[PDB]
Ligand binder design. Structure first.
Ligand SMILES: OC[C@H](O[C@H]1CCCN(Cc2nc3ccccc3[nH]2)[C@H]1c1ccccc1)c1cc(Cl)cc(Cl)c1
Ligand SMILES: [Cl-]
Length: 467
């Protein structure tokens, strides 16, 4: 009735994930949630039983257990209480139960069967169904952390090397439990991080790349650590390094450059919506996937910055540094729009616009401006017009940092005919289609010799505590 319905309504509002949901759904749940009771030691669920009902705990506690074999004692897993739940696989179709749920005292559950759950599912098209699908997406990422949190470096095999540098190297790893699942394992020498004073640069890289969920940014699942190296488990983008494709091809066509520039625009639009400056854009920071879709890979120089505030660190490759960084005036999200203009220019000509024989000479030609450079005939009138709008000296006057934000870059003449929606959907046909025969295919990468040198010194300082 009305009392019991409001009591279920007031209860669901106190449950961690169910409180964020619309009132429509909460009332529809409270109409069909049934109340079941159990005394101490009573089995709510038995392992191996076939079931169609989900349970939320309204009163008491239960003890979740599981036996891994017939002739092996049952293992204890956890103790759930008020607001917790269990049995949710039963709602998709999976009948067989994989763990025993025993009552620890007098327990009361609010229950819903698969049929009743499946029929409540079918509310308002984009009103009720909007926040539900977003709540189940938001929920999946804590479960992804839990999956990777149980693994160890010992659960992986090295397939082949993807990259090598002074930093360490990127190895293609294969999960032992699943031969179809491949990841890029970036292994970093800790003394190189300490020698370069990159402790916080990498501490922020972990925080940002794990927090990010863009199809235009390489995913970072988790990290590991030992006394010598930091290990970073990311997604495998087997399409190849953009800087090698650009090297092998020399330069890129207007249409080819457009697709890659657009992939960056979406990546930036995501980062900028969270107050994150990238600051490291250059062909080296881009990697294609097996479809030929580009993603940003290194977040070493990226920084989370509050809305309306500036940062003052002087870093980055001299050819991509914005004027406000050089001038020790502050800088924000708007420096990434400058980098987009520089990236466009190099992708179309094979060489960026500002370059001197050393950093200080390069910084002098950047300060003279984009208006002081003659654009080759190769660069199309529209591409050149966009590069000049993105490379304006004043960060306030810059395209992307004006009235409409990143939509002003998206809406530019150069982008007329560009299917922005098919790019976000993944249906737009890329310009360079890579040949990836399997998840273990590193043929789109350079050949790297095996590390024969001895390992670096230990580092047990403790700045790696979070890894
Ligand atoms: O699958 C059932 C679905 O799952 C619940 C109960 C089980 C956990 N999950 C969150 C969740 N979704 C995941 C998807 C993938 C991996 C882990 C995940 N955890 C919850 C949730 C909460 C709000 C919106 C969507 C789902 C459910 C949704 C709602 Cl709104 C109401 C009920 Cl009674 C049941
Ligand atoms: Cl993603």
């Amino acid at each position: 009735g009305l009392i019991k319905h409001t009591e279920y309504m007031e209860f669901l509002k106190s449950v961690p994930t169910f409180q964020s949901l619309p009132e429509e759904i909460l009332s529809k749940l409270a109409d069909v949630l049934e109340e079941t009771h159990y005394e101490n030691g009573e089995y709510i669920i038995r392992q191996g039983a076939r079931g169609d009902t989900f349970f939320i705990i309204s009163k008491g506690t239960v003890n979740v257990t599981r036996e891994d074999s017939p002739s092996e004692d049952p293992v204890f897993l956890r103790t759930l209480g008020k607001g917790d739940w269990f049995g949710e696989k039963a709602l998709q179709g999976e009948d067989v139960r994989t763990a025993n749920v025993i009552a620890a005292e007098a327990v009361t559950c609010l229950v819903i069967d698969r049929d009743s759950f499946k029929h409540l599912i079918g509310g308002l098209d984009d009103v009720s169904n909007k926040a539900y699908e977003d709540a189940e997406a938001k929920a999946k990422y804590e479960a992804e952390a839990a999956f990777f949190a149980n693994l160890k470096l010992s659960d992986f095999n090295i397939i082949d090397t993807l990259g090598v540098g002074g930093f360490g190297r990127v190895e293609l790893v294969q999960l032992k439990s699943e031969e179809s699942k491949t990841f890029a394992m970036k292994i970093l020498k800790k003394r190189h991080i300490v020698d370069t004073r990159q402790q916080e640069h990498i501490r922020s890289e972990k925080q940002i790349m794990q927090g990010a969920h863009s199809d235009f940014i390489v995913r970072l699942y988790r990290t590991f650590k030992d006394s010598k190296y930091l290990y970073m488990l990311m997604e495998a983008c087997l399409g190849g390094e953009l800087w090698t494709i650009l090297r092998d091809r020399g330069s890129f066509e207007d249409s080819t450059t457009r697709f890659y520039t657009a992939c960056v625009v979406e990546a930036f639009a995501y980062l900028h919506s969270k107050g994150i400056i990238y600051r490291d854009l250059k062909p080296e920071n881009l990697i294609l996937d097996h479809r030929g879709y580009a993603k940003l890979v290194d977040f070493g120089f990226a920084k989370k910055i509050g809305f309306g505030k500036k940062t003052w660190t002087f870093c980055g490759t001299p050819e991509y540094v914005a004027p406000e960084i050089i001038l020790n005036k502050g800088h924000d999200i708007s420096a990434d729009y400058w980098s987009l203009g520089i990236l466009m220019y190099e992708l179309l000509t094979g060489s960026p616009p500002f370059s001197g024989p050393d950093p200080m000479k390069t910084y002098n030609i950047i300060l003279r401006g984009i208006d002081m450079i003659e654009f080759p005939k190769k660069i199309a009138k529209n591409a050149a017009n966009l590069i000049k709008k993105l490379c304006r000296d004043n960060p306030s006057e810059r395209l992307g940092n004006l009235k409409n934000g990143v939509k002003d870059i998206q809406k530019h003449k150069w982008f007329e005919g560009f299917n922005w929606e098919g790019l976000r959907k993944g249906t737009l046909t890329p310009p360079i289609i890579p040949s990836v025969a399997s998840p273990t295919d590193t043929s789109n990468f350079d050949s790297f010799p095996e590390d024969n040198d001895e390992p670096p010194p230990d580092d047990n300082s403790g700045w790696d505590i979070d890894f």
